[PDB]
Amino acid sequence: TIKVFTTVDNINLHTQVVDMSMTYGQQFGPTYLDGADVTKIKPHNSHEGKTFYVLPNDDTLRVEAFEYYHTTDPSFLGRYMSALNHTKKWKYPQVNGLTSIKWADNNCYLATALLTLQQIELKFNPPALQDAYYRARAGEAANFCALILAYCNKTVGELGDVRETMSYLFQHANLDSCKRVLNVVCKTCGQQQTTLKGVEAVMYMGTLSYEQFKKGVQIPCTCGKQATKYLVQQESPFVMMSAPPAQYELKHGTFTCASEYTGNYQCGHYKHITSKETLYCIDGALLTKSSEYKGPITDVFYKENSYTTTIK
Ligand SMILES: Cc1ccc(OCCN(C)C)cc1C(=O)N[C@H](C)c1cc(-c2cnn(C)c2)cc(-c2cnn(C)c2)c1
Ligand SMILES: [Cl-]
Ligand SMILES: [Cl-]
Ligand SMILES: [Cl-]
Ligand SMILES: [Cl-]
Ligand SMILES: [Zn+2]
Ligand SMILES: [Zn+2]
Ligand SMILES: [Zn+2]
Ligand SMILES: [Zn+2]
């Protein structure tokens, strides 16, 4: 017999002794080692003192699994470990002092989201996400990318939308303090003030210009006469302005970062534009810079702390 360690979070470790004739799967359930499923594999001599991830099979492991991942989904572990086997192969080069991803397995939307999270203020609720968030910024983002895929129910290779991925992640972050107050003015119906919080307070779909949202955007009213909706108050460390891909001019110093989408719907390739001393363009591992930018943009991120309008 040899002794090993089983865990769900790797924070809490549980010591176990295993028999060499019985495979790891029948004694522990579904068992993984550094990405590789060892359910069918029998214990080898090198697997002494090794740390194994196991699907929770008692109440102690179930509670520890929730405390770290904030989910009770039994499929989460498998999907996470399956993505990790690919993300560990990916290359994460440092570009403009930011951690990117060499393009692989259609990850252009993942790198764009990873680059954006390093530039906006965010605190993740699941300790698993926050701990990988920290090490991702340090340059080792394999665990973080695998977790993003699992939490988004996306698999390797699958095409991804950056706005949808950011939304999923925002629901796992503490955006409770974020508030957005809007006013829709209609000549028939009048003035109606609505208050959004959380994900809805930091995301808008319709326009890329944060200024235009402050000025007002035409949206249909219940009566049918198009009404003006404008931003009244905003309390959030950032805002995300999204709109269907269209030609847009990005000016240096007026934004934080943006998403460039090029090609057909659901099969295009994403590029990341950041504002810095000059406009930088990050396409995976490649970097180009220019003073101005005009191209197909679908998401623009802006900085914010507090904002109160002047319209009466
Ligand atoms: C790359 C990708 C992967 C997955 C994905 O999932 C979607 C399915 N979800 C589960 C509903 C979507 C996408 C994608 O194309 N996104 C990009 C950002 C995208 C492109 C276009 C678009 C329009 N014309 N042309 C040539 C492209 C239009 C939109 C858009 C969004 N809202 N409106 C009202 C329009 C967005
Ligand atoms: Cl135990
Ligand atoms: Cl939760
Ligand atoms: Cl959560
Ligand atoms: Cl900004
Ligand atoms: Zn949670
Ligand atoms: Zn692969
Ligand atoms: Zn109306
Ligand atoms: Zn791509």
UniProtKB/Swiss-Prot annotation:
Active-site residues, as the UniProt record annotates them: 108 (for pl-pro activity), 269 (for pl-pro activity), 283 (for pl-pro activity)
Effect annotated for changing residue 89 to N: In strain: Beta/B.1.351
Domain Peptidase C16, residue spans: 68-312
Regulation of catalytic or functional activity: Inhibited in vitro by GRL-0617.
Compartments where found: Host endoplasmic reticulum membrane
Membrane topology (UniProt): Multi-pass membrane protein
Effect of residue 229 to Q: In strain: Gamma/P.1
Variant or mutagenesis effect after changing residue 108 to A: Unable to remove host IFIH1 (MDA5) ISGylation
Role noted for this protein: Responsible for the cleavages located at the N-terminus of the replicase polyprotein. Participates together with nsp4 in the assembly of virally-induced cytoplasmic double-membrane vesicles necessary for viral replication. Antagonizes innate immune induction of type I interferon by blocking the phosphorylation, dimerization and subsequent nuclear translocation of host IRF3. Also prevents host NF-kappa-B signaling. In addition, PL-PRO possesses a deubiquitinating/deISGylating activity and processes both 'Lys-48'- and 'Lys-63'-linked polyubiquitin chains from cellular substrates.
Protein known as: Papain-like protease nsp3
Species assigned in the record: Severe acute respiratory syndrome coronavirus 2 (2019-nCoV)
Classification lineage: Viruses, Riboviria, Orthornavirae, Pisuviricota, Pisoniviricetes
